Amino acid sequence: AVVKCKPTSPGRRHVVKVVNPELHKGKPFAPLLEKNSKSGGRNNNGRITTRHIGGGHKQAYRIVDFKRNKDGIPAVVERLEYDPNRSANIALVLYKDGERRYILAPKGLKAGDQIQSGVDAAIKPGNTLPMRNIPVGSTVHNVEMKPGKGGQLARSAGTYVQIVARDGAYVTLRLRSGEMRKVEADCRATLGEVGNAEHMLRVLGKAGAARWRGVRPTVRGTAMNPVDHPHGGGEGRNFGKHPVTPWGVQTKGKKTRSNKRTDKFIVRRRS
Amino acid sequence: MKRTFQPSVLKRNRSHGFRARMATKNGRQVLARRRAKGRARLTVSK
RNA sequence: AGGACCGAACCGACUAAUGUUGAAAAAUUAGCGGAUGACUUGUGGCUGGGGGUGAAAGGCCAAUCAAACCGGGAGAUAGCU
RNA sequence: GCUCGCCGGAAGACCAAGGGUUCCUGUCCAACGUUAAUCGGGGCAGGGUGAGUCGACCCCUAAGGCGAGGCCGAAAGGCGUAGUCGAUGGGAAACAGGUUAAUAUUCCUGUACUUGGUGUUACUGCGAAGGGGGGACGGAGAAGGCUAUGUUGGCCGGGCGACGGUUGUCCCGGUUUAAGCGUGUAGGCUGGUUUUCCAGGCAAAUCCGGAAAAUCAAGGCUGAGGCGUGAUGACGAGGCACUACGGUGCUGAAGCAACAAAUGCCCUGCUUCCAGGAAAAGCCUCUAAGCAUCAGGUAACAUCAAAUCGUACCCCAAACCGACACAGGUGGUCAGGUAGAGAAUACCAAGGCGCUUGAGAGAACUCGGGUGAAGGAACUAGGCAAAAUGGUGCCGUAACUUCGGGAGAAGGCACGCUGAUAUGUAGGUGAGGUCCCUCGCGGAUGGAGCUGAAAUCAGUCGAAGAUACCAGCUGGCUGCAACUGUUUAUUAAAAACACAGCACUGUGCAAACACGAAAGUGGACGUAUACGGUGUGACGCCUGCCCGGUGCCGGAAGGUUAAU
RNA sequence: AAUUCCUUGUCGGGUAAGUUCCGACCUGCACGAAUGGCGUAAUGAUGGCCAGGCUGUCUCCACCCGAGACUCAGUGAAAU
C-alpha cells in the first residue's frame, strides 16, 4: 500500500511509504533472534574498506531458514513479520512436530497456509523441492547453487528466477539480470516470486530517512582535491578527466568479471 | 577553552603503563633504554 | 504527525564595541542560529604518518599538518650570509 | 558584634573523574599572597579517615584486547579456535536519632534484613559443561492513581509593640517520625484445570513446544499508594540549674485536617509508528552418565562467618585541565516562597559570599550607560551601531501557491483597582449523615468545607494599567541554492559540501571493490527490488545535432609483433 | 546575465538629480540543455534595490552617571 504523505513539512512532502497492514504488530519469536552488531565498513585491520557505511538503527538478526532440509513434514504459517536484515518479509512457520522456523515470504502467502518441503511436495508457492521435479517454465525463487548450501538467488524483495531448460543433470535458469546460468539439478528451490514486490515504489523523502539505515554521505569525487581523488580540484567546475573510481580504474563501461573457474556455467551474460 | 590533557588514570595506565610496555617488543626496548640511561621512574605508573 | 513553529538548559559562532606586553597563546559584553533530531553528551575501544579520518575546507591527527613528534644517518649540503 | 549590599536552576548541597593532606588544633611571619597582615590552601609540630548492607575486590558478559593447538609470514611478527580478560551494563542485604576540634547508612542507641558453613529434628530421588523459561531491553504521545513538596485552617507555646492604631476577621514559631514486618488497593497482563498422544529442543526428560479430548469458568502473576506496627519510643518551641560560661545533666506542650501538586513512582505499563529497537550470569525447572540405607535435596532450629581495599578535603573550583590564588573548560543528583505558561525573568528563604591594594580629587582624552530642543538617513562602502516593535483576547488577513502553506501576513479594538451578578458564579475536591453491603482500601445518594477561573454591568485613580524585569520591527521587486543540515578548531558559514530524486556503469556470489606480501577480514551472516563507482541534484516543461579525436565494448580476413 | 570588453548599451519605472535595482530590446567580446537549460510556492544569521515606523548615524554636538587617566601610601614590570 503506497501512501503519499501530505506535504505538511518540507521533509514529508515527497515521502511515499509502504504500509503492509498484514505484518505482525508485536515482537518476534525470541528463540530465533541473535546478536547482530555493526562495523561501519571496517575490517579486522581496523581500516575502512567499504565506504558510506555507519550508524543508523540497531537491529537483531533473525535466523532465517534457507536450506529447508526438513522434508516430508507439513507446516502452517503463523504470521508474517518485518525483517530489517533483509528486503523481504519473513514468515514464521510451525511444523507438526512443534518446531518453528523463519522462511522468506513468497508472493501471496498469508497466515494459515500449509507449506511443505520435500521431493513429494505439491506444486504451489511455498513448497521447496529440488529442480529435478519442478517443471520447465516454473517461476522459482531462493535457488541454491551447490546442493546443500542454502538459497542464494532470488532472495531480494519481489525477484524471481525462471526455469527454462533442463538438460541431462543441469538446469539452465534465467536469473533476475536476464543472465542465463546452469545449476545442477539437485539444488532445491522454492516456488513463487518473493513477496513485498513494492519495495521499489517507496521514496525515502529526506536525507535523514537514508541516514537511518547507515547510509553516510557520498561525496562527489570532483569536489575533492587532486591528492584525495583522481578527479581532483581545478578552478571552477573542472573535470576534463576520463571517469574513474577513487583508485584509478576506469568506470562507466569497463568490465571487471575476471573469474574463470566458474565461467563454465554461465551461458549468456546479462544485457 | 578546553585543553588537551584531560587526565584519567585508567587510560594513562592502559596506554603507557608497564603491563602495557612489556606486551610488545618495542615496549621492552623502551624499558631497556630507560634502565640503561639510569632513569629512576621507568614507567608512568605510580 | 513532523530532519514542524516560538523559547530556557544544551550545542554552536552571524554582527558590532573592548581587548591585542589581554582576565584569556581565540576571551568578554549586547544582540544571534538549532533546540525530538542527519541532535547532544559521559565512560571504554578501533583506525598511525605517503598513513589515518574527512556532509570535501587540502580540513583534523596533543596550542605543530601540502606529509606529526622523538631518536638516529648527521658536524647532510649551502657556488649564499 | 550591629547594620548595608550580592547569588539563590547558584556564586547553595552531595558526588564521579582528577588531585593527595590542601582536612582539625597549637605555634611563627624570613620566603609565597600582585600591598600590610596578628591572617592563609604558607613554615613547623601533633591529630584525624572505624562498614556483613555504601563503592570497589567478586559472579556474568558488549564494542574490544590477549589468545594453547592452528593457518599465514625472509626473521621480527599477522589473523584467529578453545579459552581468558574487558563496564560505560545485569547480580544478596539498613534505616531513623545522637555524637566529634576534624569520620560517620562506618561510632553509640532503638529497631532490621541478606548470603553462606557446620550440627540436630522431620520429610525425601538427588545429580551438568546439557535442554527450557526468565533476565531481555526502541521512538513518540495521552491521562488515570498517587507521592515528594507547598499553602491555608485547626491545636500548642510565646507577644499586646520606641510613632497614630493593635484582646483581634491580630503578630511570631512549631505542628517531624524512617528501614523493616502485615494487609493487598487504583491500575497492567492473563483463561484455568485433569488426562491421552508426538517426525522438535544433537541423547533423555516428568520441563518448553505441538496435537486430541473432556472441563469449568473464575483462578493466577504483577502492582504505586494508603492503613496498622516499628513508636507508652525518638525528636520537639522551650522554660530552666551555674558549671570551668563554653552549655552541660534535667523535665519538655501541640505533634491534626483540607486543598494544590510534579519533569518523581505505578510504568520494564497502555496506545500508536517505522527506522524493527544488546549479550551472559545470578534465579526457577527438566533430565544425562553417577549415586540410589548413603550421598544429596527441602523445612525448622542452634551456632559460626562475612575477609581485604576506599572513606579526611575541594569537586562549575585559590585544591582538577589551563605556566599564575588566570573574567576560560568540566559529567550526575537534590530543585523552597511571591508574580509567572515556565528549570526564563525580578524580588527573597535555608545557605554562601562582598570578588586580597586603599585613600582623595571630580581636568582633557578612552571604556560602559542615561537624556535631548528643530529636522529625521541629510552619515556612510552600506541604516554598521543605536532607536523603535515586543503580551493575551476578539475581529481581519494580499498577489502567489507544490493546496500544506503564504500567516503571528498587513491592520483595528480591550487590558488597572473596588463593588454587584455570586457575603466566591461556572468548574475541581468532597466530609459528616442516610441506603445497600458480596462487611471493607466496597458501592449509591447527599452535598459540609477547601480550592476557584473567565465574563458582563457600574464606579474610581493616574499623564501613562501587557505600567518594572521578560518580550516579533513591517511591506514591495529580484539573483543563487529546493528545503532541515555540514565546513576552513584560531580572520572565509557561503551561491561551496551533503541531501531525497534521476541516469550511466560494473557486480551471478569463493561478486565486483577495499585493507592486506599471505592467512584472512569488510562488502554481508546481504543475493540484481541487492551491492560498488561516477555524474546531476526536490518539483514541473524537457534534455537538440556530431562516433572525426581520446576512452569503453564487440569483431577479428590480413600485416607487424617477446620469451621459447 | 555570479557570464557583456566598448558600457554609466538604448528605451520605460523609481529619484529634484540613479554607474546599483526592476521590465522590455537583442549587434550573446566569450549562454545553452544531467561539469544540465528554463520556470519555481516555502525556506536562508545568503547577495542587490526600494518604502513606512524609528531614532545623536548626522546637520552639531550639550549635560549627567560609573570605570580609568590625575594626586598621595605600599608592591613593582615591558618591548627598545
Coordinates of C-alpha atoms (C1' of nucleotides) in Angstrom, one line a residue, chain A residues 7 10 13-14 19 26 35 39 41 43-45 49-52 57 59-62 82 84-86 96-98 100 145 149 152-153 155-159 176-177 179 181 197 199-200 205-207 218 220-222 229 231 242 244-246 250 252-254 256-257 261-262 269-270, chain D residues 62-63 79-80 133 138 199-200 209-210 273-279 402-404 482-484 496-501 503-510 512-516 519-539 550-554:
Chain A
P7 CA 3.0 17.8 2.3
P10 CA 9.3 20.0 3.6
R13 CA 6.4 16.5 1.1
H14 CA 8.0 13.7 -1.0
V19 CA 2.3 0.0 4.8
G26 CA 4.4 -7.1 18.0
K35 CA 23.0 -10.5 18.3
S39 CA 31.1 -2.5 11.7
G41 CA 32.8 -0.9 6.9
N43 CA 37.5 -5.0 8.8
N44 CA 39.8 -6.7 11.3
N45 CA 42.6 -4.4 10.2
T49 CA 37.2 -0.8 3.3
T50 CA 33.6 -0.3 2.2
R51 CA 32.7 3.4 2.3
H52 CA 29.4 5.0 3.1
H57 CA 19.4 2.0 13.8
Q59 CA 18.9 -4.4 14.5
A60 CA 18.8 -8.0 15.7
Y61 CA 19.5 -10.9 13.3
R62 CA 16.5 -13.2 12.6
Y82 CA 9.1 -7.4 9.2
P84 CA 15.3 -5.3 8.8
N85 CA 18.3 -7.5 8.0
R86 CA 16.7 -8.2 4.6
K96 CA 3.7 -30.6 13.0
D97 CA 6.5 -31.6 15.4
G98 CA 6.4 -28.2 17.1
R100 CA 9.0 -23.2 14.5
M145 CA 24.0 -23.1 -6.2
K149 CA 24.3 -24.9 0.5
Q152 CA 21.4 -17.8 -2.7
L153 CA 19.5 -16.4 -5.7
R155 CA 16.3 -13.7 -2.3
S156 CA 15.6 -10.0 -2.6
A157 CA 12.1 -8.4 -2.5
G158 CA 10.0 -9.4 -5.5
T159 CA 12.6 -11.1 -7.5
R176 CA 17.0 -11.7 -12.5
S177 CA 19.6 -9.8 -14.6
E179 CA 21.6 -13.8 -17.5
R181 CA 23.1 -19.9 -15.8
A197 CA 7.0 -6.7 -4.7
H199 CA 9.9 -2.5 -2.0
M200 CA 10.8 -0.4 -5.1
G205 CA 11.9 11.7 1.0
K206 CA 14.7 13.3 3.0
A207 CA 18.3 12.8 3.9
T218 CA 28.5 10.1 -0.8
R220 CA 31.4 13.6 -5.3
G221 CA 34.8 12.8 -6.5
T222 CA 35.1 16.1 -8.4
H229 CA 40.7 11.6 -5.7
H231 CA 39.0 13.6 -10.3
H242 CA 38.0 10.2 -18.1
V244 CA 37.5 6.7 -12.8
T245 CA 37.0 5.2 -9.3
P246 CA 38.9 6.7 -6.4
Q250 CA 38.1 3.1 -15.3
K252 CA 31.3 4.0 -16.9
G253 CA 31.9 0.9 -19.0
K254 CA 35.0 -1.1 -18.1
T256 CA 35.6 -6.4 -14.1
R257 CA 34.5 -10.0 -14.2
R261 CA 36.8 -21.3 -12.7
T262 CA 33.0 -20.5 -12.6
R269 CA 25.8 -12.8 -19.8
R270 CA 23.4 -10.1 -18.8
Chain D
rA62 C1' 29.2 -5.8 24.9
rA63 C1' 32.5 -3.0 21.5
rC79 C1' 44.9 -13.2 11.9
rG80 C1' 42.3 -16.3 14.9
rG133 C1' 11.8 -20.4 31.0
rG138 C1' 13.1 1.2 20.6
rA199 C1' 8.8 -36.8 12.7
rG200 C1' 11.2 -30.9 17.8
rG209 C1' 6.8 -26.9 22.1
rG210 C1' 2.7 -29.4 19.1
rC273 C1' 4.8 4.3 14.5
rC274 C1' 8.7 2.5 11.3
rA275 C1' 13.8 3.4 11.4
rG276 C1' 12.1 -3.1 14.0
rG277 C1' 14.8 -1.4 18.9
rA278 C1' 22.3 -5.6 23.4
rA279 C1' 24.8 -10.4 25.4
rU402 C1' 3.5 22.1 -4.7
rC403 C1' -3.2 23.5 -1.9
rG404 C1' 0.4 22.1 3.4
rA482 C1' 14.7 23.5 -3.2
rC483 C1' 14.3 22.8 1.9
rU484 C1' 16.5 20.6 7.7
rA496 C1' 30.6 25.9 -1.5
rC497 C1' 29.8 20.2 0.6
rA498 C1' 25.6 16.8 1.8
rC499 C1' 20.8 15.6 0.5
rA500 C1' 16.0 12.8 -1.1
rG501 C1' 15.2 12.0 -6.6
rA503 C1' 20.7 8.2 -15.4
rC504 C1' 25.0 5.6 -16.9
rU505 C1' 28.2 1.6 -15.5
rG506 C1' 30.3 -2.6 -13.1
rU507 C1' 28.8 -6.8 -10.0
rG508 C1' 25.8 -14.4 -10.8
rC509 C1' 28.3 -14.7 -5.1
rA510 C1' 34.7 -18.0 -3.3
rA512 C1' 32.8 -6.6 -8.2
rC513 C1' 35.5 -3.1 -5.0
rA514 C1' 39.0 -2.3 -0.5
rC515 C1' 42.8 -3.3 3.9
rG516 C1' 46.3 -7.0 3.5
rA519 C1' 46.2 -16.2 6.0
rG520 C1' 42.1 -13.6 6.5
rU521 C1' 38.5 -9.7 7.1
rG522 C1' 34.9 -5.7 5.3
rG523 C1' 31.0 -5.9 1.2
rA524 C1' 27.2 -9.4 4.3
rC525 C1' 25.7 -13.6 8.2
rG526 C1' 23.4 -9.3 2.4
rU527 C1' 22.0 -12.1 -3.4
rA528 C1' 20.3 -7.8 -9.1
rU529 C1' 13.7 -4.5 -6.0
rA530 C1' 21.0 -6.3 -3.8
rC531 C1' 25.9 -4.1 -3.7
rG532 C1' 30.3 -0.8 -5.5
rG533 C1' 31.6 3.6 -8.6
rU534 C1' 30.5 8.0 -11.4
rG535 C1' 27.9 12.4 -12.8
rU536 C1' 23.5 15.5 -11.8
rG537 C1' 20.9 17.4 -7.7
rA538 C1' 13.3 18.3 -4.5
rC539 C1' 9.0 19.6 -8.1
rU550 C1' 40.9 10.3 -26.7
rG551 C1' 38.5 6.4 -23.8
rC552 C1' 35.0 1.7 -23.2
rC553 C1' 32.7 -2.5 -25.7
rG554 C1' 32.4 -6.3 -29.8

